[PDB]
Structures are given as structure tokens and as C-alpha cells.
Amino acid sequence: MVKWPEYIRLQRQKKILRMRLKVPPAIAQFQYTLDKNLAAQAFKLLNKYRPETKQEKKERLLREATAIKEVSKKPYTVKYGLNHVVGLIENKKASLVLIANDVDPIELVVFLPALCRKMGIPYAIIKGKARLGTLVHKKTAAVVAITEVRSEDKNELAKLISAVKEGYLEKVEDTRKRWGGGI
Amino acid sequence: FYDLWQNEEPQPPNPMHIPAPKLPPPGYDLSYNPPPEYLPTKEEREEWEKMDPEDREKDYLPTKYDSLRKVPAWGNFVKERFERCMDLYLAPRVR
Amino acid sequence: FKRAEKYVKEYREQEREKIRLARIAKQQGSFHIPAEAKLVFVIRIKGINKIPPKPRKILQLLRLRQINNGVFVKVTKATAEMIKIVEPWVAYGYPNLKSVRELIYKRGYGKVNGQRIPLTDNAIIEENLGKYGIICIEDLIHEIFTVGPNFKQAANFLWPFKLSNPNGGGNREEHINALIRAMN
Amino acid sequence: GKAKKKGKSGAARNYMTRTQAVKKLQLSLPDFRKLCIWKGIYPREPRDRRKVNKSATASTTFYYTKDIQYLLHEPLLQKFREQKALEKKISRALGRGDVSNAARLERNANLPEKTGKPRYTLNHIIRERYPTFQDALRDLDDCLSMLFLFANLPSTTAVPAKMIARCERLCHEFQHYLIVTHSLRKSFLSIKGIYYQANIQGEDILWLVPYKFNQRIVGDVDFRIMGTFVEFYMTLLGFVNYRLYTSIGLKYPPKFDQVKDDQGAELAAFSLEGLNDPSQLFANFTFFLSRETPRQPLEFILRAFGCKRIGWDAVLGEGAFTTDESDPRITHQIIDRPGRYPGRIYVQPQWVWDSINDEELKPPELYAPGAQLPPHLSPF
Amino acid sequence: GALKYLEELSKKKQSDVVRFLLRVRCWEYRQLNVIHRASRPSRPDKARRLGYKAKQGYVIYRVRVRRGGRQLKYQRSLRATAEERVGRRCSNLRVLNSYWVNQDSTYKYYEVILVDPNHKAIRRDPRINWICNPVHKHRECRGLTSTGKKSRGLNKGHRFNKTRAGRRKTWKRHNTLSLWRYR
RNA sequence: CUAGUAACGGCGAGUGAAGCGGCAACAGCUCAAAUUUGAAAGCUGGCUUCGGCCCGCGUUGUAAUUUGGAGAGGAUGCUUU
């Protein structure tokens, strides 16, 4: 009958293969992603801590330079960059970690749930490497971490952390060590 | 805003350029208060309302009015302007 | 599938309506206004979804059912009761005479005998009622810009003007003139 | 000793259809039409429509090749591509989510709904379109009469109220020039509205102003097309009245007061400072306009012929001569109704209209109110 | 420090997660072309330590090479054949280095790093602009890459006496009869 | 020069180095492995009144710091542009 293009067929066959093979339990744990409510409440806090864009960083530099021609505290932003975040994990400087579920060399993020478990930092596998990049003004972002928040919202971060260790990491507990797929 | 003609020279019109024929001037028919010779019969008005639009030689027939406050605004004013707009940009003109 | 959050937002937003309405009925049906009489133009404002019965009947009394339409109203003791009851769904303030001038000329529509037909002629204004000193368009403005002994009758002829939707844009002293300016 | 093809050469080169024109221009079907009113490109007809294109119909429209070549060599085509991505970038910060970046892109958009100034620069387009200042007055026949119609019109999505408020500003600016230089000579009225005739530098200009009444736009009409001719005649009259205002030497733009205009002054809200037969008619006269009488045409006619003092009602407007009818300074009071001061003579607006047409002071006894009006004559 | 975790993962490539990933990727690469372009390296730790940078001018190309004997044995390595086919395909680039990425029962799969010598991001960087010199045209054909230096035996010691300064240059020197003037 | 030495050899044919030593010439460096994280600080193009504006690359990592006879970070005091 009709003929399908080559890259079209390969996209679908890889999706079938990655979900139906005997997947080892470090890739199978990436199939379990947090709920829609928890993701929305996570991005409610994280959008309040968005990094400054190139347009408004330049504006602030022009503000401070102008005042010199004619007093602040440490900036609290959202931490990104895989090499940066892993170091923040290893020094126990992070409080909540979000991991994209679609990193296409998946080896960049396989150790990352277990590394956060070893040091005790609450993590949550999230849908969208594109969604995290939007949060941090890039096309993509494999991992997103929060380290310290301002005093006006220490309570809702600790509430969000408790909603991860109760709503996400408790359900994952006896199903992150099991092989995925089958048949 | 800058002035236009810092350097102006006449340009000969090409024979291909066919300008739009201008609209006819407002004649004696278009007035609000025509002479009684121009006043039509009420039967002619009733027949004219009976026929469908775009089936008449004249889209308007006169009617005698007394005062300015009795004179109404035309219903198809924007329709006439839009039909003109389609006339000079969607209907070609034979030279 | 209505989410649970929407349910909780409703109840907290209905209890605040119950609290404020009790505070209005507690003190009095009066507003801190000087004794000089003025005129208020009120415009429907998109607001709280579920309407309690008492603000709902006041919209009905002010013929404010459909959104974004607006009517004229003077100040009485009784009017300030309706002003502060329906306040979260309306915008109010004293307009200007030229603001009325567009509202009768450019924004003017007609209401006679229970059916809503547009304004047709000055003699049609005579045909509508045309009697209580009503001879032209400025009759309505005279009853509006100046306080009218038959302004209640002038409102009786009047219909709520369906104002125009703007695109991307407490009593206002004269800032309501900016309201129609984007909404004309 | 060689041959060619009949359909390939000749009349196919000189005239091409509208479908072939929009394909060569590589624009969308609507985007051709705004550009085609801008450069004044007209379809016309060849002598033989079958010879130009064998598969053709009389309903189809052809176009000039050099006019399309002129359309290809316009800077607006580059401005169309830059602006098209700009609305693509206004869906950028709206999509991913950035309120500040969506703002700073839309101040950079400079959209006409909040400015009144147009979206595109029409300076070079009118540079190539109209050749001389006399044709500006010839095009002022069409330029004024829609803007007096548009200023009375309400607002739609295509024409913002700020565009009309700039139309009402610009229509008032041409009126203030006319009442200073007294260039208005002839006036006619009919069912359509009020026609004014004024001569500027020997050029007669005719425009039609309908009455102060909301007009039904019922039917199939295009506001997107109509909003462009607003932008057309905004810039043209803005260019025309700029040239003539330095010609009379008064400082431009005229100064305006906001809130005193908001009180309903209409014509009388603005101050003019002269440094940065018409006059003899009502050279020393006193006028009052009553509640029924049309305030805008009567004041425009009186000030155009040098009437020094015109008063009217406090609900018709403000910032004028004293409203009180008991004040005996008034000579003639305009009344159209179905005190009785002997000092003031009681008349109609028709007496003004016929005494300004004949310029011979038509008798108020033959034009006394309560009596049948004698039939008037068209000045044309 | 995510790349230290990747280095230990490539060490354990018989393990469950790496055998799974190498299986599902070798299947994907068989439907693809013989030589095709990769947007990002499959082993980003290996590419970066071999010289790859995320700059305009660096590209990654993946090639499958037939495996087995030529009992004639081809002295040219499979890696050197992988370099030579890509350089023929991209005659405008310079082959920098190559590394093993996968293998099968019939094919062996290599990813090669190439540098554009005409891109002026490359031309302005003193760490890479040595490759813009014309003595580095087609390094994979002269044996100037890491595979070539291994097969040419360019190592110090008494074991590599015949090949450390060039094998043919050593033979020509030892087989030359040198006659002086005052003999 | 070692040296027709060691070594390998139908131990026949023969094949055949290197270290040391005297000279000629001399020159040392760049990454990956680190968190800039109190601020992607980096770069390609386009428009340019040539002054500085936009797009894009890039956090799956572009600058600066470091390259194991090292180095980093503090502290301290001299010395260099």
C-alpha cells in the first residue's frame, strides 16, 4: 500500500522498543514522572526565581553604572547546567532537584536520581527538557536545581520538598529497582 | 516630516497607464429639495421598492424633504464606498 | 473534570462577598460624599463569576445583565447603596460632558415601546416620546450633564449602551474619562 | 530562418493577471491589497484579453508589468518581512512566558491602537505617488470627506478610538486654517450631508460631511480595507496642513489643552499664535446658536467668514460667549423650533445658508421662522 | 562533575544499562546511512577529552565499517578507514580525532570529530587555529591522527627503533653509502 | 664513532641494530579531568550614520584559573605592567 518515510518510521519504532524491551532499572525509573499538580506547583515557585535575561541584565548594569557617574544582597536564582548542578549535589548545596526525562544521551542523567538519593537531596523526574529550558531562558536544560530561596518563601519551598518526598519519592520507592517493559 | 520636492522633473506618461474614470459630479437629482417636476409618483416609489437591489438603472430616486432635521443619513453609504473600493481595485477598465 | 482548586477558590471568594455585604448593611446605606449633587456613569466590569442574589437584582435594576454595557445614574441616598453593593463588578465615576457627547452621538442607540431600534432621526426622537422638553439629542445631554427633573424619565427612554471592547487597555474623580476613551 | 512561440513572447510580458502578480510578488493574498492601495497600482485592461492570456475570462483582472516591478522595488517589502517576524516574536514571549520581553517587543512594535501615528512610514510612498502640491488639493477632495465621515464614525477593531481622536484632531486642524484665511466660499447640503467648497491657491476642494449622527454600517463591508484609507488620509492631510501652516507662518502643530477640550469645547479648545467679500459678510455681528441648531456646521461657517462673536448653549458646548439669552448683545439668534426679546432677531440656519451662498444678505423677513421656507438653489 | 560519572560508565560497557543502550543504538544506526551527521556526540565525555568543543565549526560524523579479515590482514586499522571515508565525504573539513562508539556482528561504528578551518570562530582561537595551516590538510591520509601514530609505531624506546623517526626514513638512512672528501 | 659488535640465521647464502661518547642545533607548551555560580563573564553572522544595535550558537558548556618534577584556596609582604 502506501509508503512511509524513513525517519518517520524510525521515530515510532524507537518509541516501541524503548517501552517494550527489558529495560534496566535505571532507565525504567525515568518512565515514572511526577503528577500534573506537583509539576504546576513546582513551577509556581521556580518561576519566581527565574534568572535574568540578557536584556534586563544589561539594563541593571546600565543602572548601576549611571549611579556611579552621578547596597544589595546575594541574588537567589535557579541553578542550571549539568556540570554545575552535579557539583551542587555533591557539596549538599542543593535543596530540590528536577531532572528532565528525555535527555537523549541518557547516560548524562542515569546516575543523577541515585546520586541525589545518596546525599539525601529530594529529586523529581520531570517531563520536558524543553520546559526546564523555558524556565531558565535556554532552548534546553537537562537539570534544574534550587539551592537557597529568599526569606519570603522559605515555607513554600519546604512545603514543595515535602510534597516530593511524599507524593513522588514514596511511590517510586519499591518500583525504581525493578526492570521495565517485558513481553 | 521633510519636504518632498528637493528635486522634481516631469515624467512622460506611458501609453500603458490607463487612469481611473472619475466619478460623475452630483447632479440635480441628488438634492434634498428637488423641483416638483423631479418629484416622482408614489406608485413609482412603491414599484421601485418592490424590485430587488442591483436591478435598477438608478440606485436612488429623489424624495422632497422640508427641514435638515427631517433629512436622514443614507443607509448604504459605507456599502457604496466599499462597492467603489471593489470597483477601482477589482474591476478592470477598458480604454 | 473541574479541579479541586477551583472549588476552594469559589468558597473563599464567596465568603469575602458575604463579609463585605454584611459590612455595607452594618454601617448604613450611605457614602461619604459632599452635599453637592453629581452624575455617575457606571460600566459593567468582568469580575466574580457567581453573583449573590442582592448584587444580581441590582444589576437587573440597573439593566446591567449582559457584560460591558453601561448606563447613566445620578446620586441619591439610595444610589450609593447600589453603588457600593455592585462595586466589584462595576466601574464608576463622574464623566465629562464631551464624554456624554460621544455617548449620545457615536455610541447612541434607541429604546422605545419595549423594542430596541437604533436612533433614526431627530423627528424620531420626537416620535419616540419627544414631549417632556425632548426636541433633539441635546435633551438627553441636558438631563445628564445638568441634573434633570425628568432625568428618571430620560433614563426610562435610555437603553444601556453596548460599549466597545478595548484591546489591551473606589471612585474615579475624572479618571473615568479615560475609561470610555479606550472603550469608545 | 528561425521560429519562436506566440504565447511566450509579447502580450504575456506586458500584461499579467492578478494571480501571476501575487505569485511573483511572493506575498499573501491580503498583504498584496494593502501594498496595492499604497503604490496606487491599478489593474486596467489590454486591448485583447484573449491575446494576453489564452485561458482568460472577462472577470479576471490583469496588471502592468512595470507597476509590479515598482512593487518589487519598494522598501515596504523589506518592512513587511521584518514586521511579520515581529508579530512572530510577540508570540515568542507570550508563548514561553515573559511579560517584560513581550512588553519591550511591543513598544518596539509601536502599534497604532495606542499611538494614533501609523504603523508604517508613508513618506516615500507619497513621494512617488502624487507629483505636485496642486494634486494634493485635488486628492484633498477624497482625503477630507472620508475623514469627516470617519471622525463621526464609531470605533471598530480596525480603527481605534485614538485613530478617530487623531482624525477629529486633524479634521479640526484643516478647519482652523480655513477660518483664518477665509478660503471657504460655497456650501451645499443634500440627503448625503453637507458639501463645502473652498479655493486654496486657485484650486477648488470639495468634501462631504454627513450630519452629527451615528451611521449604520450594516452589510458586508471591510474595516481592514477601511482602516488603511484612514492611514492614507491621516498622513496626507497631516502633510498637506503642515505645508500650508508654514505657508501662513503660524507655528505648527497648534497647541491643545486636554481637559478644557474634555469639557466639550470641540472647535474652540485650541490656541493659535500667529508667530512662532468674505470678511465684509458679518464683519461686526453677534450670533447665538440654540439647542436644536447644528453646532458644528454653524460655527465652522461663521468663523470662516469672520464672525467675531459666536455663542451657544452650555449643553451644546463651553468656552464661548455668555449662554444667557437675556443678554442684549446678541443680534441674531439661530432657532429651529416648532423670551421674545425685540433686540434679538429670530431666524433659522437656512437664512445663514442662503445669505452665505448669494452673499447678498437675504432678508430675515422672507426667512422668518414659523413660516414656510422658500426653496433654495444649488450653487453648482 | 558529571563527566567523571560518564568515564566510569564507559569502563563498564558490558553492564546492564550500557549493553542495553549499545543494543538499541546499534539497531538505530543500521537503518541510517553508512556515513551520516550526528548533532551531538553519543559519548560527550569521550569527544570532549579528544578535543570536541560546542562551537560553530566542530561537527561529529558517525560511520560504520565492515569488520573481519581482508589469511591477508589489512595493516590499515578499521579506525583509520573510518577517518578516511569521512574526510573524503567532507573534503572541506579537517579530521581531528575519532573514537569507538558501537559495534555489531558485521559492522564497527565510529564517531569522528571534524573542525572547519574556514570558519572564523575556529580561525580566531589560538587553541585550534593550528589546524588552519595547510600542513594539516588530510591528516587521516598521512597517518597523522591517533590511529595513524599507533600503527606507525611512533613511540619512544628500544622496542620502536625501526619506526620512531619514520620507518622509511630509517631504512633510507641505513641503506645509504656515505662518502666524504678526505677518506 | 659504537660496528660488520649484539642479535637472528637451509647457522650456507648471509642479514644486521641500539645504549654510552664527540659534535651541529636548541624552546618549550595547549587541553580533558573542578561550581563564574555574587550574576555565559565567551563566540558566528546581519544592519550600520562606524558609534553600537539585533538575530543566532551555547548550560548535553563558550571565557578566565590549572596541566602531576605540578597546581588550587586562604593569609602575608615585597616585586611587575
PDB file of N, CA and C in Angstrom, chain A residues 6 9-10 13-14 17 21-24 26-27 82-83 86-87 90 104-108 110-111 115 179, chain E residues 1-3 5-6 9-10 16-18 20-21 23-25 27-28 31-33 40-44 48:
ATOM      1  N   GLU A   6      11.555   7.330   5.840  1.00  0.00           N
ATOM      2  CA  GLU A   6      12.492   6.536   6.630  1.00  0.00           C
ATOM      3  C   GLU A   6      12.609   7.049   8.059  1.00  0.00           C
ATOM      4  N   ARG A   9       9.356   6.354  10.234  1.00  0.00           N
ATOM      5  CA  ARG A   9       9.192   5.012  10.775  1.00  0.00           C
ATOM      6  C   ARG A   9      10.137   4.768  11.941  1.00  0.00           C
ATOM      7  N   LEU A  10      11.347   5.318  11.867  1.00  0.00           N
ATOM      8  CA  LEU A  10      12.351   5.052  12.888  1.00  0.00           C
ATOM      9  C   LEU A  10      12.006   5.741  14.198  1.00  0.00           C
ATOM     10  N   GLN A  13       9.453   3.318  15.828  1.00  0.00           N
ATOM     11  CA  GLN A  13       9.990   2.023  16.220  1.00  0.00           C
ATOM     12  C   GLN A  13      10.887   2.144  17.443  1.00  0.00           C
ATOM     13  N   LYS A  14      11.575   3.277  17.587  1.00  0.00           N
ATOM     14  CA  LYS A  14      12.377   3.509  18.783  1.00  0.00           C
ATOM     15  C   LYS A  14      11.493   3.714  20.006  1.00  0.00           C
ATOM     16  N   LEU A  17      10.384   0.310  20.997  1.00  0.00           N
ATOM     17  CA  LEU A  17      11.476  -0.501  21.521  1.00  0.00           C
ATOM     18  C   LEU A  17      11.885  -0.056  22.920  1.00  0.00           C
ATOM     19  N   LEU A  21      11.052  -3.350  25.492  1.00  0.00           N
ATOM     20  CA  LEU A  21      12.196  -4.204  25.763  1.00  0.00           C
ATOM     21  C   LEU A  21      12.344  -4.424  27.268  1.00  0.00           C
ATOM     22  N   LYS A  22      13.319  -5.244  27.642  1.00  0.00           N
ATOM     23  CA  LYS A  22      13.609  -5.476  29.056  1.00  0.00           C
ATOM     24  C   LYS A  22      14.541  -4.372  29.545  1.00  0.00           C
ATOM     25  N   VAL A  23      13.951  -3.273  29.988  1.00  0.00           N
ATOM     26  CA  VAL A  23      14.712  -2.060  30.294  1.00  0.00           C
ATOM     27  C   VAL A  23      15.332  -2.191  31.682  1.00  0.00           C
ATOM     28  N   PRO A  24      16.628  -1.931  31.828  1.00  0.00           N
ATOM     29  CA  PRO A  24      17.272  -1.986  33.140  1.00  0.00           C
ATOM     30  C   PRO A  24      16.714  -0.933  34.078  1.00  0.00           C
ATOM     31  N   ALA A  26      17.372   1.656  35.674  1.00  0.00           N
ATOM     32  CA  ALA A  26      17.907   2.994  35.856  1.00  0.00           C
ATOM     33  C   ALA A  26      17.366   3.846  34.725  1.00  0.00           C
ATOM     34  N   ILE A  27      16.968   3.180  33.649  1.00  0.00           N
ATOM     35  CA  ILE A  27      16.229   3.837  32.586  1.00  0.00           C
ATOM     36  C   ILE A  27      14.726   3.658  32.785  1.00  0.00           C
ATOM     37  N   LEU A  82      24.470  21.020  33.871  1.00  0.00           N
ATOM     38  CA  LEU A  82      24.659  19.682  34.420  1.00  0.00           C
ATOM     39  C   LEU A  82      25.920  19.594  35.260  1.00  0.00           C
ATOM     40  N   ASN A  83      27.006  20.185  34.774  1.00  0.00           N
ATOM     41  CA  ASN A  83      28.263  20.121  35.500  1.00  0.00           C
ATOM     42  C   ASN A  83      28.204  20.967  36.763  1.00  0.00           C
ATOM     43  N   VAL A  86      25.549  18.995  39.392  1.00  0.00           N
ATOM     44  CA  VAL A  86      26.144  17.801  39.995  1.00  0.00           C
ATOM     45  C   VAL A  86      27.114  18.186  41.102  1.00  0.00           C
ATOM     46  N   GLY A  87      27.877  19.255  40.894  1.00  0.00           N
ATOM     47  CA  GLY A  87      28.734  19.756  41.953  1.00  0.00           C
ATOM     48  C   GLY A  87      27.955  20.305  43.131  1.00  0.00           C
ATOM     49  N   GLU A  90      26.906  17.332  45.054  1.00  0.00           N
ATOM     50  CA  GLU A  90      27.987  16.652  45.757  1.00  0.00           C
ATOM     51  C   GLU A  90      28.459  17.430  46.972  1.00  0.00           C
ATOM     52  N   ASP A 104      18.633  12.767  25.533  1.00  0.00           N
ATOM     53  CA  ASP A 104      18.813  11.723  24.529  1.00  0.00           C
ATOM     54  C   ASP A 104      20.142  10.957  24.531  1.00  0.00           C
ATOM     55  N   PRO A 105      21.286  11.483  25.012  1.00  0.00           N
ATOM     56  CA  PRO A 105      22.214  10.568  25.684  1.00  0.00           C
ATOM     57  C   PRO A 105      21.782  10.442  27.130  1.00  0.00           C
ATOM     58  N   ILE A 106      21.155   9.325  27.498  1.00  0.00           N
ATOM     59  CA  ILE A 106      20.520   9.256  28.809  1.00  0.00           C
ATOM     60  C   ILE A 106      21.569   9.036  29.891  1.00  0.00           C
ATOM     61  N   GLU A 107      22.790   8.674  29.493  1.00  0.00           N
ATOM     62  CA  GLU A 107      23.899   8.497  30.421  1.00  0.00           C
ATOM     63  C   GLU A 107      24.234   9.768  31.188  1.00  0.00           C
ATOM     64  N   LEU A 108      23.838  10.931  30.672  1.00  0.00           N
ATOM     65  CA  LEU A 108      24.079  12.184  31.367  1.00  0.00           C
ATOM     66  C   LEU A 108      23.229  12.332  32.619  1.00  0.00           C
ATOM     67  N   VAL A 110      21.559   9.258  34.213  1.00  0.00           N
ATOM     68  CA  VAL A 110      21.179   7.974  34.807  1.00  0.00           C
ATOM     69  C   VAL A 110      21.581   7.914  36.275  1.00  0.00           C
ATOM     70  N   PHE A 111      22.783   8.387  36.593  1.00  0.00           N
ATOM     71  CA  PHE A 111      23.300   8.367  37.949  1.00  0.00           C
ATOM     72  C   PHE A 111      22.658   9.419  38.829  1.00  0.00           C
ATOM     73  N   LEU A 115      22.373   9.549  42.786  1.00  0.00           N
ATOM     74  CA  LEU A 115      23.306  10.436  43.462  1.00  0.00           C
ATOM     75  C   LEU A 115      22.577  11.368  44.418  1.00  0.00           C
ATOM     76  N   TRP A 179      12.929  -3.999  36.835  1.00  0.00           N
ATOM     77  CA  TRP A 179      13.134  -3.885  35.403  1.00  0.00           C
ATOM     78  C   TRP A 179      11.845  -3.470  34.710  1.00  0.00           C
TER      79      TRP A 179
ATOM     80  N   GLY E   1      30.490  18.067  37.834  1.00  0.00           N
ATOM     81  CA  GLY E   1      31.388  16.975  37.519  1.00  0.00           C
ATOM     82  C   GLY E   1      30.673  15.749  37.003  1.00  0.00           C
ATOM     83  N   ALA E   2      29.750  15.956  36.065  1.00  0.00           N
ATOM     84  CA  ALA E   2      29.001  14.837  35.511  1.00  0.00           C
ATOM     85  C   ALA E   2      29.875  13.940  34.651  1.00  0.00           C
ATOM     86  N   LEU E   3      30.971  14.475  34.113  1.00  0.00           N
ATOM     87  CA  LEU E   3      31.766  13.714  33.158  1.00  0.00           C
ATOM     88  C   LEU E   3      32.642  12.671  33.834  1.00  0.00           C
ATOM     89  N   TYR E   5      31.389  10.730  36.133  1.00  0.00           N
ATOM     90  CA  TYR E   5      30.470   9.602  36.202  1.00  0.00           C
ATOM     91  C   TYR E   5      30.328   8.923  34.848  1.00  0.00           C
ATOM     92  N   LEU E   6      30.480   9.676  33.761  1.00  0.00           N
ATOM     93  CA  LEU E   6      30.384   9.068  32.440  1.00  0.00           C
ATOM     94  C   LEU E   6      31.629   8.261  32.111  1.00  0.00           C
ATOM     95  N   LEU E   9      31.283   4.927  33.507  1.00  0.00           N
ATOM     96  CA  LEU E   9      30.244   4.160  32.829  1.00  0.00           C
ATOM     97  C   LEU E   9      30.774   3.499  31.565  1.00  0.00           C
ATOM     98  N   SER E  10      31.614   4.211  30.812  1.00  0.00           N
ATOM     99  CA  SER E  10      32.177   3.643  29.595  1.00  0.00           C
ATOM    100  C   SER E  10      33.159   2.527  29.907  1.00  0.00           C
ATOM    101  N   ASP E  16      24.532  -3.718  32.512  1.00  0.00           N
ATOM    102  CA  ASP E  16      23.135  -3.805  32.101  1.00  0.00           C
ATOM    103  C   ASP E  16      22.672  -2.552  31.370  1.00  0.00           C
ATOM    104  N   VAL E  17      22.995  -1.369  31.894  1.00  0.00           N
ATOM    105  CA  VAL E  17      22.490  -0.158  31.258  1.00  0.00           C
ATOM    106  C   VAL E  17      23.292   0.171  30.005  1.00  0.00           C
ATOM    107  N   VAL E  18      24.558  -0.237  29.951  1.00  0.00           N
ATOM    108  CA  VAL E  18      25.358   0.132  28.790  1.00  0.00           C
ATOM    109  C   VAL E  18      25.187  -0.881  27.671  1.00  0.00           C
ATOM    110  N   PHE E  20      22.339  -2.361  27.186  1.00  0.00           N
ATOM    111  CA  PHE E  20      21.027  -2.002  26.671  1.00  0.00           C
ATOM    112  C   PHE E  20      21.117  -0.811  25.732  1.00  0.00           C
ATOM    113  N   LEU E  21      21.874   0.209  26.124  1.00  0.00           N
ATOM    114  CA  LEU E  21      21.962   1.411  25.307  1.00  0.00           C
ATOM    115  C   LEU E  21      22.748   1.154  24.034  1.00  0.00           C
ATOM    116  N   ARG E  23      22.794  -1.678  22.486  1.00  0.00           N
ATOM    117  CA  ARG E  23      21.961  -2.512  21.630  1.00  0.00           C
ATOM    118  C   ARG E  23      20.925  -1.679  20.892  1.00  0.00           C
ATOM    119  N   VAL E  24      20.261  -0.766  21.599  1.00  0.00           N
ATOM    120  CA  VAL E  24      19.178  -0.004  20.986  1.00  0.00           C
ATOM    121  C   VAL E  24      19.730   1.069  20.061  1.00  0.00           C
ATOM    122  N   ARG E  25      20.989   1.456  20.252  1.00  0.00           N
ATOM    123  CA  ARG E  25      21.584   2.450  19.370  1.00  0.00           C
ATOM    124  C   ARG E  25      22.182   1.808  18.129  1.00  0.00           C
ATOM    125  N   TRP E  27      20.993  -0.819  16.697  1.00  0.00           N
ATOM    126  CA  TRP E  27      19.831  -1.077  15.857  1.00  0.00           C
ATOM    127  C   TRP E  27      19.436   0.167  15.079  1.00  0.00           C
ATOM    128  N   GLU E  28      19.448   1.324  15.742  1.00  0.00           N
ATOM    129  CA  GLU E  28      19.067   2.567  15.080  1.00  0.00           C
ATOM    130  C   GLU E  28      20.057   2.938  13.987  1.00  0.00           C
ATOM    131  N   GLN E  31      19.735   1.287  10.303  1.00  0.00           N
ATOM    132  CA  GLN E  31      18.778   1.807   9.339  1.00  0.00           C
ATOM    133  C   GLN E  31      19.258   3.115   8.732  1.00  0.00           C
ATOM    134  N   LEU E  32      20.222   3.768   9.365  1.00  0.00           N
ATOM    135  CA  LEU E  32      20.734   5.048   8.903  1.00  0.00           C
ATOM    136  C   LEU E  32      21.722   4.812   7.760  1.00  0.00           C
ATOM    137  N   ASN E  33      22.347   5.883   7.283  1.00  0.00           N
ATOM    138  CA  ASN E  33      23.308   5.785   6.199  1.00  0.00           C
ATOM    139  C   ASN E  33      24.618   5.184   6.699  1.00  0.00           C
ATOM    140  N   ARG E  40      24.959  15.756  18.183  1.00  0.00           N
ATOM    141  CA  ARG E  40      25.763  15.728  19.384  1.00  0.00           C
ATOM    142  C   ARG E  40      26.444  14.374  19.524  1.00  0.00           C
ATOM    143  N   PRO E  41      27.604  14.307  20.170  1.00  0.00           N
ATOM    144  CA  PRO E  41      28.263  13.013  20.351  1.00  0.00           C
ATOM    145  C   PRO E  41      27.476  12.093  21.264  1.00  0.00           C
ATOM    146  N   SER E  42      27.525  10.801  20.944  1.00  0.00           N
ATOM    147  CA  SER E  42      26.853   9.808  21.768  1.00  0.00           C
ATOM    148  C   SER E  42      27.560   9.613  23.095  1.00  0.00           C
ATOM    149  N   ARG E  43      28.866   9.864  23.136  1.00  0.00           N
ATOM    150  CA  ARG E  43      29.664   9.813  24.355  1.00  0.00           C
ATOM    151  C   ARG E  43      30.309  11.184  24.510  1.00  0.00           C
ATOM    152  N   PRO E  44      29.604  12.144  25.112  1.00  0.00           N
ATOM    153  CA  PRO E  44      30.130  13.514  25.174  1.00  0.00           C
ATOM    154  C   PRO E  44      31.375  13.656  26.025  1.00  0.00           C
ATOM    155  N   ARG E  48      34.876  15.201  24.248  1.00  0.00           N
ATOM    156  CA  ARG E  48      35.455  16.407  24.822  1.00  0.00           C
ATOM    157  C   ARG E  48      36.908  16.193  25.225  1.00  0.00           C
TER     158      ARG E  48
END
